[PDB]
Design a protein around this motif. Structure first.
Motif, PDB file in Angstrom:
ATOM      1  N   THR A  35       1.171  -1.281   0.062  1.00  9.40           N
ATOM      2  CA  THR A  35       0.031   0.062  -0.139  1.00  9.40           C
ATOM      3  C   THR A  35       0.387   1.438  -0.171  1.00  9.40           C
ATOM      4  N   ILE A  36       0.199   2.640  -0.929  1.00 11.34           N
ATOM      5  CA  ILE A  36       0.890   3.390  -0.485  1.00 11.34           C
ATOM      6  C   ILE A  36       0.579   4.414   0.893  1.00 11.34           C
ATOM      7  N   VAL A  37       1.360   4.916   1.227  1.00 12.27           N
ATOM      8  CA  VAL A  37       0.936   5.561   2.702  1.00 12.27           C
ATOM      9  C   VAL A  37       1.979   6.565   3.135  1.00 12.27           C
ATOM     10  N   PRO A  38       1.607   7.670   3.328  1.00 13.33           N
ATOM     11  CA  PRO A  38       2.837   9.229   4.242  1.00 13.33           C
ATOM     12  C   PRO A  38       4.097   8.034   4.858  1.00 13.33           C
ATOM     13  N   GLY A  39       4.802   8.307   4.956  1.00  9.46           N
ATOM     14  CA  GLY A  39       6.140   7.565   4.863  1.00  9.46           C
ATOM     15  C   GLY A  39       6.705   8.577   6.090  1.00  9.46           C
ATOM     16  N   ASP A  40       7.431  10.324   4.858  1.00 12.90           N
ATOM     17  CA  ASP A  40       8.091  10.873   5.339  1.00 12.90           C
ATOM     18  C   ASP A  40       7.391  12.562   5.612  1.00 12.90           C
ATOM     19  N   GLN A  41       7.368  13.474   5.843  1.00 14.52           N
ATOM     20  CA  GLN A  41       7.157  15.406   5.013  1.00 14.52           C
ATOM     21  C   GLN A  41       7.633  16.398   5.286  1.00 14.52           C
ATOM     22  N   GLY A  42       7.903  17.522   5.608  1.00  8.86           N
ATOM     23  CA  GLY A  42       8.036  18.719   5.812  1.00  8.86           C
ATOM     24  C   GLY A  42       7.917  19.691   5.693  1.00  8.86           C
ATOM     25  N   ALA A  43       8.478  21.036   6.452  1.00 10.76           N
ATOM     26  CA  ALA A  43       8.425  21.787   6.779  1.00 10.76           C
ATOM     27  C   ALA A  43       8.360  23.101   5.772  1.00 10.76           C
ATOM     28  N   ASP A  44       8.871  22.626   5.304  1.00 13.91           N
ATOM     29  CA  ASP A  44      10.680  23.544   4.468  1.00 13.91           C
ATOM     30  C   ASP A  44      10.859  22.911   3.119  1.00 13.91           C
ATOM     31  N   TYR A  45      11.335  23.651   2.787  1.00 15.40           N
ATOM     32  CA  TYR A  45      12.341  23.247   1.070  1.00 15.40           C
ATOM     33  C   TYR A  45      14.178  21.920   1.821  1.00 15.40           C
ATOM     34  N   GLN A  46      14.536  22.989   2.702  1.00 12.23           N
ATOM     35  CA  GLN A  46      15.502  22.476   3.472  1.00 12.23           C
ATOM     36  C   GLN A  46      15.112  20.802   4.002  1.00 12.23           C
ATOM     37  N   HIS A  47      13.765  20.961   3.986  1.00 15.70           N
ATOM     38  CA  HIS A  47      13.751  19.261   4.918  1.00 15.70           C
ATOM     39  C   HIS A  47      13.897  18.645   3.712  1.00 15.70           C
ATOM     40  N   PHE A  48      12.989  18.477   2.688  1.00 16.33           N
ATOM     41  CA  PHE A  48      13.645  17.061   1.133  1.00 16.33           C
ATOM     42  C   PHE A  48      15.160  17.157   1.300  1.00 16.33           C
ATOM     43  N   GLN A  50      17.281  16.672   3.837  1.00 16.78           N
ATOM     44  CA  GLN A  50      16.976  15.647   5.202  1.00 16.78           C
ATOM     45  C   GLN A  50      16.645  14.609   4.786  1.00 16.78           C
ATOM     46  N   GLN A  51      15.650  14.861   3.710  1.00 14.05           N
ATOM     47  CA  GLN A  51      14.690  13.866   3.393  1.00 14.05           C
ATOM     48  C   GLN A  51      14.880  13.178   2.382  1.00 14.05           C
ATOM     49  N   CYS A  52      15.948  13.388   1.440  1.00 13.46           N
ATOM     50  CA  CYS A  52      15.602  13.215  -0.202  1.00 13.46           C
ATOM     51  C   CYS A  52      17.209  11.802   0.056  1.00 13.46           C
ATOM     52  N   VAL A 113       9.185  14.845 -12.614  1.00 17.59           N
ATOM     53  CA  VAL A 113       9.695  13.497 -12.433  1.00 17.59           C
ATOM     54  C   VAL A 113      11.148  13.425 -12.422  1.00 17.59           C
ATOM     55  N   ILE A 114      11.772  13.178 -10.852  1.00 16.10           N
ATOM     56  CA  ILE A 114      13.213  13.029 -10.582  1.00 16.10           C
ATOM     57  C   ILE A 114      14.397  12.118 -10.702  1.00 16.10           C
ATOM     58  N   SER A 115      15.674  12.215 -11.105  1.00 14.91           N
ATOM     59  CA  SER A 115      16.085  11.179 -10.708  1.00 14.91           C
ATOM     60  C   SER A 115      17.578  11.743 -10.115  1.00 14.91           C
ATOM     61  N   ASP A 116      17.535  12.765  -9.277  1.00 11.68           N
ATOM     62  CA  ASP A 116      18.960  12.658  -8.449  1.00 11.68           C
ATOM     63  C   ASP A 116      18.906  13.971  -7.713  1.00 11.68           C
ATOM     64  N   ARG A 117      19.152  14.191  -6.641  1.00 11.76           N
ATOM     65  CA  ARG A 117      19.450  15.188  -5.039  1.00 11.76           C
ATOM     66  C   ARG A 117      19.566  17.236  -6.081  1.00 11.76           C
ATOM     67  N   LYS A 118      20.007  16.920  -6.761  1.00  9.45           N
ATOM     68  CA  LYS A 118      20.911  18.341  -7.539  1.00  9.45           C
ATOM     69  C   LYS A 118      19.482  18.571  -8.279  1.00  9.45           C
ATOM     70  N   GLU A 119      18.577  17.334  -8.875  1.00 12.60           N
ATOM     71  CA  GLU A 119      16.737  17.450  -9.835  1.00 12.60           C
ATOM     72  C   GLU A 119      16.345  18.800  -8.542  1.00 12.60           C
ATOM     73  N   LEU A 120      16.457  18.884  -7.168  1.00 16.53           N
ATOM     74  CA  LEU A 120      14.681  19.297  -6.877  1.00 16.53           C
ATOM     75  C   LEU A 120      15.461  20.716  -6.531  1.00 16.53           C
ATOM     76  N   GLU A 121      16.388  21.210  -6.995  1.00 13.10           N
ATOM     77  CA  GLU A 121      16.157  22.619  -6.968  1.00 13.10           C
ATOM     78  C   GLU A 121      15.342  23.231  -7.521  1.00 13.10           C
ATOM     79  N   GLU A 122      15.667  24.147  -6.701  1.00 13.01           N
ATOM     80  CA  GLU A 122      14.490  25.205  -6.702  1.00 13.01           C
ATOM     81  C   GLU A 122      14.089  26.031  -8.297  1.00 13.01           C
TER      82      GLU A 122
END
Length: 142
Positions: A35-48, A50-52, A113-122
């Motif tokens: 099943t697909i259910v919540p696993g992580d979250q974020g209150a700001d981008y900086q979290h992405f 410590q989450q990536c 879609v993304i495949s790298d953490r550097k691709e999560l830039e704003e």
């Protein structure tokens, strides 16, 4: 049976991510078992950050600024995270399930879609929306 998505959770955050209460900038879920259910979250981008994790897979949903479309003054998009160290099982599932939660989209503009953490830039997702003009047609598909 076949696949079970808990988009019910994401939904609560999907449209609420636009409220001035929760503030949960974005929410990510991961295939837990069947099943697909919540696993992580974020209150700001900086979290992405410590989450990536290139060793995990999940979808992301954050509201980016548009500085143009006075529409709610803000854009809404979903992002896909394909870790490079997950098992092959959930892999075939992401395909079928990612299409399930994607069909339940009714409060955004486009998904990415993304495949790298550097691709999560704003500046990366920002210049992606300003485009909104798929033209790879001359690319004979991919």
């Amino acid at each position: 049976m076949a696949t079970k998505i808990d988009k019910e959770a994401c939904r609560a955050a999907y449209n609420l991510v636009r409220d001035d209460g929760s503030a949960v900038i974005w929410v990510t879920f991961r295939y837990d078992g069947a099943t697909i259910v919540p696993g992580d979250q974020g209150a700001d981008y900086q979290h992405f950050i410590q989450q990536c994790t290139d060793d995990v897979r999940l979808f992301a949903f954050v509201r980016f600024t548009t500085g143009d479309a006075m529409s709610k003054r803000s854009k809404f998009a979903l992002i896909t995270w394909i870790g490079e160290d997950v098992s092959g099982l959930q892999r075939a599932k992401t395909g079928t399930d990612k299409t399930l939660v994607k069909e339940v989209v009714q409060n955004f503009a486009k998904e990415f879609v993304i495949s790298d953490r550097k691709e999560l830039e704003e500046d990366f997702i920002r210049s992606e929306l300003k485009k909104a003009g798929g033209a790879n047609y001359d690319a004979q598909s991919e």
